[PDB]
Design a protein around this ligand. Sequence first.
Ligand SMILES: *[C@@H]1O[C@H](CO)[C@@H](O[C@@H]2O[C@H](CO)[C@@H](O[C@@H]3O[C@H](CO)[C@@H](O)[C@H](O)[C@@H]3O)[C@H](O)[C@H]2NC(C)=O)[C@H](O)[C@H]1NC(C)=O
Ligand SMILES: *[C@@H]1O[C@H](CO)[C@@H](O[C@@H]2O[C@H](CO)[C@@H](O)[C@H](O)[C@H]2NC(C)=O)[C@H](O)[C@H]1NC(C)=O
Ligand SMILES: *[C@@H]1O[C@H](CO)[C@@H](O[C@@H]2O[C@H](CO)[C@@H](O)[C@H](O)[C@H]2NC(C)=O)[C@H](O)[C@H]1NC(C)=O
Ligand SMILES: *[C@@H]1O[C@H](CO)[C@@H](O)[C@H](O)[C@H]1NC(C)=O
Ligand SMILES: *[C@@H]1O[C@H](CO)[C@@H](O)[C@H](O)[C@H]1NC(C)=O
Ligand SMILES: *[C@@H]1O[C@H](CO)[C@@H](O)[C@H](O)[C@H]1NC(C)=O
Ligand SMILES: *[C@@H]1O[C@H](CO)[C@@H](O)[C@H](O)[C@H]1NC(C)=O
Ligand SMILES: *[C@@H]1O[C@H](CO)[C@@H](O)[C@H](O)[C@H]1NC(C)=O
Ligand SMILES: *[C@@H]1O[C@H](CO)[C@@H](O)[C@H](O)[C@H]1NC(C)=O
Ligand SMILES: *[C@@H]1O[C@H](CO)[C@@H](O)[C@H](O)[C@H]1NC(C)=O
Ligand SMILES: *[C@@H]1O[C@H](CO)[C@@H](O)[C@H](O)[C@H]1NC(C)=O
Ligand SMILES: *[C@@H]1O[C@H](CO)[C@@H](O)[C@H](O)[C@H]1NC(C)=O
Ligand SMILES: *[C@@H]1O[C@H](CO)[C@@H](O)[C@H](O)[C@H]1NC(C)=O
Ligand SMILES: *[C@@H]1O[C@H](CO)[C@@H](O)[C@H](O)[C@H]1NC(C)=O
Ligand SMILES: *[C@@H]1O[C@H](CO)[C@@H](O)[C@H](O)[C@H]1NC(C)=O
Ligand SMILES: *[C@@H]1O[C@H](CO)[C@@H](O)[C@H](O)[C@H]1NC(C)=O
Ligand SMILES: *[C@@H]1O[C@H](CO)[C@@H](O)[C@H](O)[C@H]1NC(C)=O
Ligand SMILES: *[C@@H]1O[C@H](CO)[C@@H](O)[C@H](O)[C@H]1NC(C)=O
Ligand SMILES: *[C@@H]1O[C@H](CO)[C@@H](O)[C@H](O)[C@H]1NC(C)=O
Ligand SMILES: *[C@@H]1O[C@H](CO)[C@@H](O)[C@H](O)[C@H]1NC(C)=O
Lengths: 447, 129, 129, 129
Amino acid sequence: ENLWVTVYYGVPVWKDAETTLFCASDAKAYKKHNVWATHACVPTDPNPQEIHLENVTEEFNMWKNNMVEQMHTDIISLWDQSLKPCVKLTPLCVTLQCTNVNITDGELKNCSFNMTTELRDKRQKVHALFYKLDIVPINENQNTSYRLINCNTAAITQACPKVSFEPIPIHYCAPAGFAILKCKDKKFNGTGPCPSVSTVQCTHGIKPVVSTQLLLNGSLAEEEVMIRSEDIRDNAKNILVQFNTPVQINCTRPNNNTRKSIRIGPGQWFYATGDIIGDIRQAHCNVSKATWNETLGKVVKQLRKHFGNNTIIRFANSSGGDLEVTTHSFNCGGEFFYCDTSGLFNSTWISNDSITLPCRIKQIINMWQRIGQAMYAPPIQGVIRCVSNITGLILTRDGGSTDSTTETFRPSGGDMRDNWRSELYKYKVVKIEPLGVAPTRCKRRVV
Amino acid sequence: VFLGFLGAAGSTMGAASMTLTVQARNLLSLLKLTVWGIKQLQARVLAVERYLRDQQLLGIWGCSGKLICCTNVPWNSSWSNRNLSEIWDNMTWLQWDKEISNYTQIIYGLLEESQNQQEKNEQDLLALD
Amino acid sequence: VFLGFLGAAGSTMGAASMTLTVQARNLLSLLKLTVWGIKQLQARVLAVERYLRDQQLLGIWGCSGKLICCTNVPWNSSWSNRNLSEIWDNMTWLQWDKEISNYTQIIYGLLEESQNQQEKNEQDLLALD
Amino acid sequence: VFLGFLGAAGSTMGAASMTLTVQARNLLSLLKLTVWGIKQLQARVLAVERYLRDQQLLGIWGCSGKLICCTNVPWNSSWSNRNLSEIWDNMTWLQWDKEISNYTQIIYGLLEESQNQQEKNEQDLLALD
Ligand SMILES: *[C@@H]1O[C@H](CO)[C@@H](O[C@@H]2O[C@H](CO)[C@@H](O[C@@H]3O[C@H](CO)[C@@H](O)[C@H](O)[C@@H]3O)[C@H](O)[C@H]2NC(C)=O)[C@H](O)[C@H]1NC(C)=O
Ligand SMILES: *[C@@H]1O[C@H](CO)[C@@H](O[C@@H]2O[C@H](CO)[C@@H](O)[C@H](O)[C@H]2NC(C)=O)[C@H](O)[C@H]1NC(C)=O
Ligand SMILES: *[C@@H]1O[C@H](CO)[C@@H](O[C@@H]2O[C@H](CO)[C@@H](O)[C@H](O)[C@H]2NC(C)=O)[C@H](O)[C@H]1NC(C)=O
Ligand SMILES: *[C@@H]1O[C@H](CO)[C@@H](O)[C@H](O)[C@H]1NC(C)=O
Ligand SMILES: *[C@@H]1O[C@H](CO)[C@@H](O)[C@H](O)[C@H]1NC(C)=O
Ligand SMILES: *[C@@H]1O[C@H](CO)[C@@H](O)[C@H](O)[C@H]1NC(C)=O
Ligand SMILES: *[C@@H]1O[C@H](CO)[C@@H](O)[C@H](O)[C@H]1NC(C)=O
Ligand SMILES: *[C@@H]1O[C@H](CO)[C@@H](O)[C@H](O)[C@H]1NC(C)=O
Ligand SMILES: *[C@@H]1O[C@H](CO)[C@@H](O)[C@H](O)[C@H]1NC(C)=O
Ligand SMILES: *[C@@H]1O[C@H](CO)[C@@H](O)[C@H](O)[C@H]1NC(C)=O
Ligand SMILES: *[C@@H]1O[C@H](CO)[C@@H](O)[C@H](O)[C@H]1NC(C)=O
Ligand SMILES: *[C@@H]1O[C@H](CO)[C@@H](O)[C@H](O)[C@H]1NC(C)=O
Ligand SMILES: *[C@@H]1O[C@H](CO)[C@@H](O)[C@H](O)[C@H]1NC(C)=O
Ligand SMILES: *[C@@H]1O[C@H](CO)[C@@H](O)[C@H](O)[C@H]1NC(C)=O
Ligand SMILES: *[C@@H]1O[C@H](CO)[C@@H](O)[C@H](O)[C@H]1NC(C)=O
Ligand SMILES: *[C@@H]1O[C@H](CO)[C@@H](O)[C@H](O)[C@H]1NC(C)=O
Ligand SMILES: *[C@@H]1O[C@H](CO)[C@@H](O)[C@H](O)[C@H]1NC(C)=O
Ligand SMILES: *[C@@H]1O[C@H](CO)[C@@H](O)[C@H](O)[C@H]1NC(C)=O
Ligand SMILES: *[C@@H]1O[C@H](CO)[C@@H](O)[C@H](O)[C@H]1NC(C)=O
Ligand SMILES: *[C@@H]1O[C@H](CO)[C@@H](O)[C@H](O)[C@H]1NC(C)=O
């Protein structure tokens, strides 16, 4: 009956907290120095230890997750460190005098200009092909003199031709004293308590694929497709879609480009685009119409679970933004594509003939809101072809004064952190507090 | 019978307290200025600081080397009115830590003052002769 | 008679056990971005991590304050079949650590579970009245 | 009656020894590359180094949990010849530590070897049956 407190060291008690997570990649031996794995990331254990926790119900919140905010700062920090020792193209801001490549009634122009050399007093005049998207006119009245797109606003740095942009799986691990709780619920939406909860030390193989609108090479959802959103009744918040059946998309760059290496200084090597050997064919992506329409139909069935059993659901092309948010932007073999998704979202829903998507290619890119730094993608010599696995979508409503009669959905990509939320929605970092008091009928021996 | 780290998180406090050694083990164990190296170094110091924090409190409670330590502090009924059968055979350490979370600071303050702040003086005076 | 750090490395295990305090002492003790500073700071953190690693095991084994600690774990003959004469008065801790290295992990598991995981619960029930 | 940390620094050694619990408490408690961050990081590692250093010496002396601890080492008259009334009721710990500073290294060597290096083996053989 006489109760006394007792100290228990090692009790299974955790609390929501945010700590510094670190990288982890498997022993991939190989052309190396990819930006994400860097020189050294922690080698993954040969056998991950996932331990299920019975009778445990934990709250999750993919939108207030701290793993996304840290990872977004990690990818950005890795990008600058892989470009600092590379050649900066600040002297490449010379006035360009261009022309059109002999076709009557073009997306690329042949430009000649004076460039610096290995020696200071000697100058060279070189010819190089540029894409129209990376060049703006200087006279607008108009003549035929041009300049680079960034030279007026931000500096430009040429990516080293040794580093690769291919995303490899990255595992985020927790330091000692902290643990990551994975929610294994098949029907788990955005937030809320998760019935089936296990714990792991590192996350699964998350491939950092920088995309827009379409989520490529992402993790599929089990059972039915999932519609996760912070506020479905809010138009300002993006709508994260996760497929269960992956759709296939083949993208190619038929142009047989050539690399024209021209020296612009002592140790400085600038790689421009040489004349295309063969025919001029603009890039494109093919999507199976039978699979895309089927998968899109599977989406509207789950959208009706939040907007009425019977309602009008339509899909249209992106009507807001420019450049990268109106096109499906991604990296493929080194070159950066910008595909018009007008053929994908052109249906209205109520109650083998593949789709082709025209794509445009840039070389001076401004990703992650970066006002100040621009990257020059060197020309990839040869023909590029990649096959991707679109598993998700990032849509956004239009809102308005509609009386819930019709409902429109348009693709968007206002931020990059939505890409990591599609792969961190199930994880949660918590700190372990092993100190716990409890009353028993035990008293310390005086002796 | 071992389940793993945090294996007894959903079991009763009586079944979870028999596996205190499980959570106790996994509690501590040209330029290196890379983003991964700076984070790694700051994480190792963070790990050993959390560990010594709990060991420091167990030092002022006289429970440094023990895993289950009995004291002289009487359990106040205002903290919880449940019985031993309603605590150790109905509640887990998670929901029990949530109920007493409003009193853990008061218990800790009395845990250092009621015994080891008083025993050491009496331990000196009893062993004085 | 003290020889110094690692002085009894080549001595018998019985003669080396009388100098445990020798290895115990010498075991722990505009911009600072210099290569040597990074090394020196990373060496101090690496040092205190290994020190608390061993002290961590001494906590869960009930041997926190002592240098020689008796336990409740019976020695299995599968680990070594040698007698006390062949071990303490003919073998060194080096060639002894090499002979038990295949079983040191198994011994550690029973060393934390068989006793201090069971003794503290029995200490609670024996001091219950 | 508490004065605070080092409050009895000018007191006699007998009045200051009655408040050893006071000094024991206040003895441990986009880019982070700021000069202050480097200073904080190196200060936290510096703090736990001095803390674990004192606890390491108390561990090899068998005085881990206590604040006043008796030993087996007999006091050599060459260290200080003062009487008990002349030390605890006439001198302070500051001027006392300055007087024994030339023999503290010899005392520590005998403090760990004469007893706890010998006691653990004697306690092993006393508990042999
Ligand atoms: C999504 O994952 C697929 C996985 O197949 C990616 O396509 C693959 O991209 C890699 C990029 O390194 C290709 O490897 C390259 O192959 C060429 C072939 O000559 C070689 O010259 C290069 O050195 C490199 O090894 C790989 O071939 C390609 N897959 C296929 C079937 O061709 C895709 O790029 C990923 N999505 C995104 C957005 O990156
Ligand atoms: C990408 O599409 C491929 C098409 O085959 C899928 O690949 C197969 O997945 C199963 C499931 O484990 C494996 O047994 C096969 O070995 C996979 N084949 C290849 C070539 O990878 C894959 O599931 C899709 N991945 C994503 C992320 O959508
Ligand atoms: C989305 O669809 C609209 C509707 O066709 C496109 O608007 C037309 O764009 C073409 C150029 O491709 C212009 O010549 C027409 O004048 C535009 N208006 C029409 C046809 O009414 C729009 O370009 C598509 N893409 C985006 C990003 O909005
Ligand atoms: C060159 O081609 C582009 C795109 O086809 C066209 O807009 C431009 O008018 C052409 N150049 C001239 C001088 O007309
Ligand atoms: C730049 O090129 C023009 C011809 O296009 C030439 O007249 C001029 O001298 C060149 N400038 C330098 C600095 O070489
Ligand atoms: C997700 O499930 C939880 C279950 O409690 C529910 O409260 C929440 O509203 C759900 N969210 C959505 C967007 O359906
Ligand atoms: C590009 O322009 C240069 C200079 O005017 C010319 O010599 C070359 O033949 C042109 N080639 C192509 C492929 O445009
Ligand atoms: C994409 O390429 C794969 C492999 O060559 C092929 O099986 C598939 O039919 C292609 N799909 C389209 C739409 O071209
Ligand atoms: C898409 O599939 C649905 C159901 O199979 C069908 O009713 C509809 O006509 C299809 N639309 C297109 C454009 O293929
Ligand atoms: C539609 O109605 C049926 C029958 O009332 C119901 O079972 C189902 O959940 C409803 N679905 C949606 C999306 O409202
Ligand atoms: C969208 O579909 C309608 C009807 O099939 C067609 O008239 C229109 O040209 C299509 N638009 C695009 C951009 O494919
Ligand atoms: C519990 O706390 C109250 C408030 O300080 C006090 O009056 C009461 O005596 C305490 N009871 C026990 C059993 O400690
Ligand atoms: C105890 O703390 C919780 C913290 O969420 C709070 O909700 C609750 O009202 C508190 N109860 C009392 C009695 O202070
Ligand atoms: C080394 O071997 C010699 C052999 O005579 C022995 O006397 C001595 O005790 C051993 N250990 C030492 C020297 O530390
Ligand atoms: C020693 O270990 C072996 C192998 O696991 C086992 O068969 C045997 O019973 C054990 N004996 C003792 C005394 O522990
Ligand atoms: C001890 O072991 C040694 C070596 O295996 C052996 O020679 C000896 O007979 C055993 N018994 C005793 C009592 O030494
Ligand atoms: C430990 O295992 C290795 C690998 O089989 C073996 O070579 C060695 O002899 C073993 N040592 C002992 C003491 O069992
Ligand atoms: C200071 O001196 C006074 C007078 O002798 C004494 O009462 C007091 O305890 C002393 N305090 C300290 C800290 O020396
Ligand atoms: C007394 O002190 C002297 C000098 O410090 C030392 O050499 C001697 O061994 C000591 N004797 C004893 C019995 O401690
Ligand atoms: C101790 O005190 C006595 C006086 O009672 C004195 O004669 C003696 O010298 C003192 N011992 C010393 C100073 O070592």
